[PDB]
Design a binder for these strands. Sequence first.
DNA 1: GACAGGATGTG
DNA 2: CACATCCTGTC
Length: 93
Amino acid sequence: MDSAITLWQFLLQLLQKPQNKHMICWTSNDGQFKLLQAEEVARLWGIRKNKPNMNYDKLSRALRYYYVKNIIKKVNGQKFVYKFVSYPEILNM
DNA sequence: GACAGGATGTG
DNA sequence: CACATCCTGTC
């Protein structure tokens, strides 16, 4: 219902349901996560925001904007792996 | 292709 | 603001 949802909140919600482990999962105990099925998560993000043409190219650009915002960072050298900068703070928020 | 980040546009 | 879209470049 809430269409104001942000990408990081949405990704947090996906990682919270173990039934989504197939496409996105935690890869550390400190906030690192991997987009196992990147195009699949991008598809879900588009449906959520009603942007039918959403894909990883664009979902990843949205994640790149987080770097300076200190919300999410890239885990260098690790394909599709990013990290929530302030974890678990963002969780209990 | 994945990834970085600038340019322009939208609500 | 918070992306969505498109693009130049690197590797």
